[PDB]
Amino acid sequence: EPRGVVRITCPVALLQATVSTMLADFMASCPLVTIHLEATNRQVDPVAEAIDIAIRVRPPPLQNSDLVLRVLGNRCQCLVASPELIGRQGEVNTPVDLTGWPSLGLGQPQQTFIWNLEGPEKAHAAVYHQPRLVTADMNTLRSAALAGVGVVQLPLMMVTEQLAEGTLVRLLPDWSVRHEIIHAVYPSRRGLLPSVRSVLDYLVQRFSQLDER
Amino acid sequence: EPRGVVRITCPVALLQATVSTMLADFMASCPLVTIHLEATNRQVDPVAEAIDIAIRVRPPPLQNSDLVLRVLGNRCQCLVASPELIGRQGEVNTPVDLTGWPSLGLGQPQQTFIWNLEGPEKAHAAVYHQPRLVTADMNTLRSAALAGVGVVQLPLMMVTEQLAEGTLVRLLPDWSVRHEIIHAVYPSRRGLLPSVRSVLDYLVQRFSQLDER
Numbered sequence: 482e483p484r485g486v487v488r489i490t491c492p493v494a495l496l497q498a499t500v501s502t503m504l505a506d507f508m509a510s511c512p513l514v515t516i517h518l519e520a521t522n523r524q525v526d527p528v529a530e531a532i533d534i535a536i537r538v539r540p541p542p543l544q545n546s547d548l549v550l551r552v553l554g555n556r557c558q559c560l561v562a563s564p565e566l567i568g569r570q571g572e573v574n575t576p577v578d579l580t581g582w583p584s585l586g587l588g589q590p591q592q593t594f595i596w597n598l599e600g601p602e603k604a605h606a607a608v609y610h611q612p613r614l615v616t617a618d619m620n621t622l623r624s625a626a627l628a629g630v631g632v633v634q635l636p637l638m639m640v641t642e643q644l645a646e647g648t649l650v651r652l653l654p655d656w657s658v659r660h661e662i663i664h665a666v667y668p669s670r671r672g673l674l675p676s677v678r679s680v681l682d683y684l685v686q687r688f689s690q691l692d693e694r
Numbered sequence: 695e696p697r698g699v700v701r702i703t704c705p706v707a708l709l710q711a712t713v714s715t716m717l718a719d720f721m722a723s724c725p726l727v728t729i730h731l732e733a734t735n736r737q738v739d740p741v742a743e744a745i746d747i748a749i750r751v752r753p754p755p756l757q758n759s760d761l762v763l764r765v766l767g768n769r770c771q772c773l774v775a776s777p778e779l780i781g782r783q784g785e786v787n788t789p790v791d792l793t794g795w796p797s798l799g800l801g802q803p804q805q806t807f808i809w810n811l812e813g814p815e816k817a818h819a820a821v822y823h824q825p826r827l828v829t830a831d832m833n834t835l836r837s838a839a840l841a842g843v844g845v846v847q848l849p850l851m852m853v854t855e856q857l858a859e860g861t862l863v864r865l866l867p868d869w870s871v872r873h874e875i876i877h878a879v880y881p882s883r884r885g886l887l888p889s890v891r892s893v894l895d896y897l898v899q900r901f902s903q904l905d906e907r
């Protein structure tokens with residue numbers, strides 16, 4: 482019954498870990514729907530590039546633009562390093578202790594990398610680091626952290642198996658990094674289209690069925 | 695001993711499946727080397743953007759540009775679909791039989807998607823398809839193919855576990871799609887730098903230790 486083309490954008494790590502299997506199951510149940518899916522980590526302007534659904538992962542506050550916003554879930558972040566690296570660099574009891582640790586950075590080389598932390602008694606700390614590895618691929622960062630290259634901040638869901646095995650260890654567990662909000666942004670008119678709506682509703686139902694943090 | 699910044703580009707699927715663990719191990723053994731790694735599937739111009747090492751995956755023939763070329767390995771491709779999809783769409787004994795099958799496409803939406811095939815007795819076939827799913831992420835394509843959304847062409851190394859389980863099946867096994875060559879392209883002067891060379895040599899040794907096809 483739903484038929485037409487739907488143009489979607491989604492960050493890479495979220496697509497591989499979560500969104501891909503949703504879209505696969507949707508397309509199996511809606512044979513007449515065509516999906517053009519750009520896997521990119523760039524900020525996408527939905528109105529100009531005529532994007533029907535743009536999935537984003539950003540920390541609050543979020544864009545109060547003219548676009549419609551639907552929240553899909555919250556994902557917490559954490560600072561991790563390997564036991565080997567911890568054995569060499571000392572103890573981390575306050576954010577100041579991270580100064581000088583080798584680090585890894587998610588993004589582009591020209592960016593300024595800073596860990597924003599909130600701790601007990603409403604304490605805030607902002608720790609600048611010069612990472613020796615900079616990339617947008619979360620898989621590569623996790624493998625580098627596993628080898629003890631540097632401390633890195635990753636989404637919890639990306640490292641759950643490693644932390645359970647002990648091959649990665651959480652630093653400063655009493656402090657917390659700002660959480661990220663998985664949300665979908667769409668132009669008001671595009672969501673009216675029947676095919677776009679069916680895709681939108683199915684994602685909402687699938688994300689509601691998840692109990693990830 | 696090696697120290698400095700090395701700027702590298704690498705396609706996503708190859709980075710996640712292969713190149714990431716190499717760079718991780720290298721950086722653990724060379725603490726003074728900084729790596730800026732862009733994970734992108736775009737054609738990178740190394741000379742203009744001042745890229746030290748650009749890793750590419752393209753079928754032969756390759757660029758005879760002024761850049762230095764080092765071959766790292768050959769990766770064969772194959773056409774796969776799920777048993778369920780095969781049960782619904784009929785039998786595939788010649789490339790003509792693929793006409794009309796729902797398909798998936800690796801790339802951008804505006805591209806023209808054609809399967810180039812070579813068969814027995816030096817027979818060539820070129821099968822145009824209109825894919826209902828278009829993306830650059832290989833993981834998403836594999837999950838869609840697993841759900842029976844469409845026939846897709848993927849690198850063999852990406853589907854070895856699926857084919858062994860039977861959840862994906864190889865179409866037209868007597869025909870072959872052109873193979874892809876993993877190679878690294880670098881400006882002649884940039885490779886002279888000590889840090890770039892150490893990275894280059896380590897990749898050459900690591901890829902030589904692989905016996906992937």
Ligand SMILES: O=C(O)c1cccc(O)c1
Nearest residue numbers: 494495498556636638661
């Ligand atoms: O929960 C996830 O799988 C996830 C994936 C990517 C980014 C992110 O913040 C969260």
Ligand SMILES: O=C(O)c1cccc(O)c1
Nearest residue numbers: 707708711769849851874
């Ligand atoms: O052999 C691989 O892992 C590979 C990964 C990506 C592309 C490709 O042609 C091959």
